[PDB]
From a paper:
Henipaviruses, a genus within the Paramyxoviridae family, include the highly virulent Nipah and Hendra viruses that cause reoccurring outbreaks of deadly disease. Recent discoveries of several new Paramyxoviridae species, including the zoonotic Langya virus, have revealed much higher antigenic diversity than currently characterized and prompted the reorganization of these viruses into the Henipavirus and Parahenipavirus genera. Here, to explore the limits of structural and antigenic variation in both genera, collectively referred to here as HNVs, we constructed an expanded, antigenically diverse panel of HNV fusion and attachment glycoproteins from 56 unique HNV strains that better reflects global HNV diversity. We expressed and purified the [name] ectodomains and the attachment protein head domains and characterized their biochemical, biophysical and structural properties.
Cryo-electron microscopy structures of diverse fusion proteins elucidated molecular determinants of differential pre-fusion state metastability and higher order contacts.
Author numbering:
A (entry chain A), B (entry chain B), C (entry chain C): 22 to 477
D (entry chain D): 121 to 169
E (entry chain E): 367 to 415
Write the structure that this text describes.
């Protein structure tokens, strides 16, 4: 890439950040109980639990049936010198992708630990308070919290005799219908195929009044630095059990880690408008350019958070470009496109390493110590300004001081190759198609003639 | 459609589901009061209600004025020999569409029931419960409702003498400003013309702390199957009265029904990347194909919920398929197209009816019953695997078993027709300006230079 | 623009509205405190505040460090003997844009008032009410505010001795983690650069239970007319101080003003389907056209609210248009394109000042005054209907009265110049310039064979 | 040898788990004992003399 | 029958029957026609499968 030619065409080199990908996830198990444990409300709670149980049993059973059918598709067998594992029936699975097979193998791996957690069902159902982490000894652990247990431990509990018990029953009915709406909301796509779809951790936190940091602290991840404080929306994980007796869901989540791809640098750019031909044009270049050892790729940070120093993507999102884009970035300003703008929110001056790249044709340019105007040269379009001209610079209204040095050559004395104006239209495509059709039906007629008039 | 040749080019036939569209909605009338009914708060309330009333009058009055002004534009009566038809004064509308005319006809139909409900205005204002019912007629009832009646029937009510009255006034003021912000949020577009704009039941549920099925159960519609569980975000409603005296809105909502268009099958597909020419190409084929009586069209599931067995759309979204894309789904699969995929998250193998489609040049293939690797055939890129080669298969890192058979003929043996590469950029449109201008007046040079010597 | 030719091709002139842009904002300074001043809970609170303090200090300190670092590069005292103003150290900025320099100038201007407010730090930290005011000067005041100060002055306070101290400490812990998650949610992009990023008033509002109206009332803006009720989602503001002692944020917001651009009228259009060639087509025109002294241009109301009388934008969004589209709007219906539809939700009739534009080929058209059907003319497609034919009109099912007349030019007798059937270009038409261009490069080889024709 | 390397790298966590009860190992006063490794797991400490 | 072995960081591997890869580049390693025993050092790839 040539930054002098890219400055002549109108792009200014922005910051440079790093690139990091989530990788190497270890697994930690939790459970999520559904039935609220009321113990103080044994005096008057009526049977308001029954409608809630009837509502949740319609959405507890088929997930359990689907997961046990997933365990039925796999079978721990070994033909000859096999790996002594995996093995699924092709007929018993129907149509599946690679990730569905991976989920089946994950279930076949963690069925033992699912049985280990299911061994403590009576310990699960006796949790009076909401958030606790239990364990299977020194190694392996499980966690549980309920976003509604505190509301019937500090809110619904103390009005046990001041308020009428029918009003407590009605309030608990309203609260249970609201929370059943919340579980109905979060497990929207989870009702279709509850083995291959991961769980958004923020949507899980929405069950508990949007407290991502409570589950972050209770999960064990304790971020300290700047980069991992914003990170934490990339936890993911899939359900492993949907036990009906204790009315709980055993979930497995992944503890993330940000590994770094070597040699890859994300490059930002600033696009300013330039007045050529009495017209304001913007350069047509992508904003982000990732470089890794003479290799330009394209990325999209649609789901990627950007810190002050790096790019944090959940997974690598490399995209290709045309080799004409490589010619535009390397040497060919004629291959670089342009677009028409007339709106007022176009920047015309910018700052880079104490060097001002300014379109002085539309913006006022002066040096305040000398009190003289700065005129646009006819050879250039984008004006380079350093301390060689004046260290004291006045641009528009703003009052700046510049410094450092130029850097190789000035962009102003190099010639500027203006490319074609990039402006498309479906009408242009349609009458181009008509033009191409009539012209090649002319040429094929004359080629049939000129092939028949070869031999005279 | 030929799945064998389309599998050879790289498209795998997925699940087949049904198509069902919402049709025949019946009507039911609800009423929503806005002023909270305090009856226990006659001791300490001050006049904090007046600020809330002055805030909501600017919403209530012009909505009701526009409603009665739209009510004036329609009249009944016989046009001579014709009996009726709700004759609409077109000079009183200005610019109106078909849906506005239909809505005006709907309110003219609902004038009688709106007056019948408005006869029970003093019945509406006397409620002190959250949600309760009043008998509209001998077999009709109304569904007067408040989400915030409960909050000043269980929270502010017991603190009548423990806390100071000015603090209850301040908390009531804060809650009233928050609720007025909620009505300002939900009736945003509804202030412009409150007679043609449909009302979402979800944004209404946001007024009552996001409890959808409380409103659904008070409506009386009850879901009992898997399809009507995720259904519930598509119930629409219309304002039929905007009464300023009791400060309430009479609304008419529509109970949905998922009718089935006959013969329509939604076919899914799996796209994999195949290495041709040293490059990993992805085919350019869509995902969801509606098929109905040998007719291929396009659909978009941008708002349609997807079940395990069917596609549920609020309204029919049949878009025309490109006949080039229809011939792509026919035997001319060279007309399909392909693009670069260099990213690592490209699947290379998939399962369908015990049938493995695998790009085996990059993915390790062996059969542990024979302990030999599987090599890519030279006549194809996509690799067929069934029980005929080996019933027990290793693909990549995973160990599977297969079944069934090929299907008509094997897609691995016939010749292959490779399409063109596909780019998506306006830079390609400027390059098509350039290379046609390399060719067009060079084709005119064919027209000139041939005829110069074809004479003799 | 010709409405008669555009109605002949199938487009009806909609409403005409105004265009207003936010401009000339003044600035008001507010403060936001973070540490909840619990005063009644000095008996049983433990040191649960310390975990909250250690969680928020890692956010508060780097924001304050970047804030003092950005203000440390700007200086007064211009070395020019006549000009005097603020100078930024452009070598010390590195890379910066126009808005960043303007923001640094703004904080340099506001540093004096920031120190003036910072002189009242003990006044800021001593508040025990939710929102109140303090004496900044003889006429200036601050608007110190807390959403959570109510919740530990009306909810957690009365359970001081009924409930156990550790349960209050745990409830305080849960509430503190949830609110700390809320501050982590709202100050997401602000952690990268808290100088050049404005803060939305609604993002501030979700810190206080989504109460935009409380912040609007305490800020001083009191919307009274219909246009400023929907406006209020576009209020901008930036931080001026990030004090770590009282752990508060001094913010500067901009009070907006909706100025009106002169002469600009926004025009809507209604596109009706027309049956040409046995086929249903739609004209290809934009929905909204801004006209300003005979100047057609394009806008996008993607972030602009739409009122009943005007278009209100936060900032001007003037987009250019193709001159072929301008000829399409003015005179050239042959330059206007058309697209294919077959879906059922295409209205074929509409009303405009009592003028019925109705395609009678698919929609039943009758005159109820005479009981005769209305036939489509062969010279037109869209049916003009006014009081000249019949005053009482049957369309579809509906009785409709009509009004006015043809105005100036009758489109019912005008000739038809429906242009080319232009086609969409989703992914495929690039290969129609990629499989036809290789026929062109077959003819490029035929140029070499034409050279052989010339030689032989 | 590489397979043995993989085996020790595979079983070093369980080796640390068994080494966590070193004082439980030295307190046996009988011939053969079975001490609980985890919840449903055990090893065999043994001394024929 | 062993088909690969290590000698001072030198891998002699019969890659015709044994899978051979370099995950720095994520490509397989093929068999030459001039030899059967495959020479592998860090000049091809430092980390080998
Ligand atoms: C999931 O798998 C279990 C276990 O069955 C095992 O896996 C299957 C995939 C097949 O390969 C089986 O051969 C294999 O054993 C299934 O549970 C089994 O269900 C069947 C009925 O489907 C039970 O048979 C019944 O048993 C008694 C006999 O007295 C009578 O009620 C009936 O006449 C009937 O024969 C069987 O006992 C039961 N258990 C076992 C160990 O086989 C299970 O059905 C299967 N699938 C699903 C969808 O749940
Ligand atoms: C909605 O309609 C009602 C009813 O009026 C009927 O419908 C209109 C659309 C027109 O076609 C009317 O001719 C038709 O009767 C309107 O209420 C009417 O308002 C008018 C004023 O606009 C009243 O007239 C006034 O009445 C008294 C007479 O002593 C004096 O104050 C004035 O001199 C003046 O004449 C009229 O009484 C009233 N009622 C009726 C039955 O006509 C209403 O205005 C209309 N539109 C809106 C926007 O509210
Ligand atoms: C923000 O600006 C302050 C003020 O300093 C002034 O501005 C700077 C940009 C420079 O141009 C300075 O020359 C100018 O005075 C800076 O604070 C200063 O930092 C220096 C260290 O960089 C301090 O010196 C220390 O002082 C004591 C002496 O006992 C000892 O701790 C050390 O040995 C060391 O010398 C200095 O006191 C301090 N203040 C002043 C008034 O100069 C600051 O660095 C700058 N930047 C930031 C990021 O805060
Ligand atoms: C409420 O339940 C708790 C926890 O079990 C117990 O300590 C307390 O005594 C109960 N109170 C009453 C009144 O039952
Ligand atoms: C592109 O740049 C190269 C040098 O990098 C030069 O040789 C070539 O002529 C340029 N092509 C253009 C301007 O079309
Ligand atoms: C730019 O070129 C001109 C001559 O065209 C020369 O005077 C000037 O020094 C050059 N600037 C550089 C190389 O930075
Ligand atoms: C060009 O396009 C059409 C299809 O739109 C094709 O059928 C026709 O033969 C071509 N030629 C002409 C002269 O229209
Ligand atoms: C509160 O209001 C209800 C409903 O009107 C009534 O039954 C009850 O007696 C009231 N309580 C008091 C203390 O006034
Ligand atoms: C498309 O397939 C048909 C048979 O279905 C064949 O006649 C025709 O030549 C093919 N066209 C191509 C490959 O362009
Ligand atoms: C594919 O063709 C080969 C010969 O090229 C033949 O052996 C094989 O049976 C064919 N597969 C079918 C018809 O399924
Ligand atoms: C070639 O360029 C000319 C202008 O020089 C333009 O009129 C013409 O349309 C271009 N040809 C195309 C786009 O095929
Ligand atoms: C609660 O705090 C307020 C305000 O400081 C004070 O007036 C009141 O006496 C306190 N009450 C108790 C019980 O501490
Ligand atoms: C466009 O309209 C103008 C008059 O407004 C006319 O002169 C011109 O021929 C038209 N062009 C077409 C129909 O292509
Ligand atoms: C439309 O033109 C016809 C003749 O073509 C004429 O009879 C009729 O009056 C015209 N309508 C007008 C000018 O409104
Ligand atoms: C133009 O044709 C060449 C040669 O057939 C081909 O490589 C190229 O991809 C074509 N251009 C486009 C834009 O498809």
């Amino acid at each position: 890439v040539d930054f002098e030619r890219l400055a002549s065409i109108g792009g200014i080199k922005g910051h440079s950040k790093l690139y990091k990908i989530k990788g190497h996830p270890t697994t930690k198990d939790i459970v999520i109980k559904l039935v609220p444990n009321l113990n103080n409300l044994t005096v008057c709670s009526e049977m308001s639990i029954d409608g809630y149980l009837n509502l949740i049993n319609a959405v507890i059973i088929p997930i359990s049936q689907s997961l046990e059918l997933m365990r039925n598709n796999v079978k721990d067998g070994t033909p000859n010198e096999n790996i002594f594992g995996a093995i699924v029936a092709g007929a018993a699975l129907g149509i599946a992708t690679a990730a569905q097979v991976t989920s089946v193998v994950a279930l076949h791996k963690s069925n033992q630990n699912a049985a280990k957690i299911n061994s403590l069902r009576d310990s699960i159902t006796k949790t009076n308070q909401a958030v606790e982490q239990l364990s299977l000894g020194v190694q392996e652990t499980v966690s549980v919290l309920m976003g509604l247990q505190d509301q019937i431990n500090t809110n619904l509990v103390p009005k046990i005799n001041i308020l009428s018990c029918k009003q407590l029953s009605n309030t608990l009915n309203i609260m249970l219908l609201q929370y059943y709406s919340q579980i109905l909301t979060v497990f929207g796509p989870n009702l279709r195929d509850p083995a291959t779809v991961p769980v958004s951790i923020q949507a899980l936190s929405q069950l508990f009044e949007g407290n991502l940091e409570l589950l972050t602290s209770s999960l064990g991840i304790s971020s300290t630095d700047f980069n991992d404080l914003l990170t934490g929306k990339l936890i993911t994980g899939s359900i492993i059990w949907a036990d009906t007796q204790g009315h709980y869901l055993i979930l497995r989540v992944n503890i993330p880690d940000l590994i770094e791809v070597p040699g890859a640098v994300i490059q930002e750019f600033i696009k300013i408008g330039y007045n050529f031909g009495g017209s304001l044009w913007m350069p047509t270049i992508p904003n982000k350019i990732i470089i890794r050892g003479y290799h330009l790729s394209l990325i999209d940070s649609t789901n990627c958070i950007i810190t002050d120093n790096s790019y944090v993507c959940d997974r690598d999102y490399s995209l290709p470009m045309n080799p004409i884009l490589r010619e535009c970035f390397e040497g060919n300003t004629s291959s670089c496109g342009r677009e028409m703008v007339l709106n007022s929110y176009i920047p015309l001056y910018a700052l880079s390493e104490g060097v001002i790249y300014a379109n002085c044709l539309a913006t006022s340019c002066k040096c305040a110590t000398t009190n003289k105007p700065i005129v646009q040269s006819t050879s250039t379009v984008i004006t380079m300004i350093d301390n060689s001209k004046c260290p004291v610079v006045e641009v528009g209204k703003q009052m700046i001081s510049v410094g450092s040095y130029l850097g190789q050559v000035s962009p102003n004395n190099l010639t500027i190759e203006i490319g074609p104006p990039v402006y498309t239209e479906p009408v242009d495509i349609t009458n181009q198609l008509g033009n191409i059709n009539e012209t090649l039906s002319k040429t094929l007629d004359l080629i049939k003639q000129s092939n028949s008039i070869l031999d005279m």
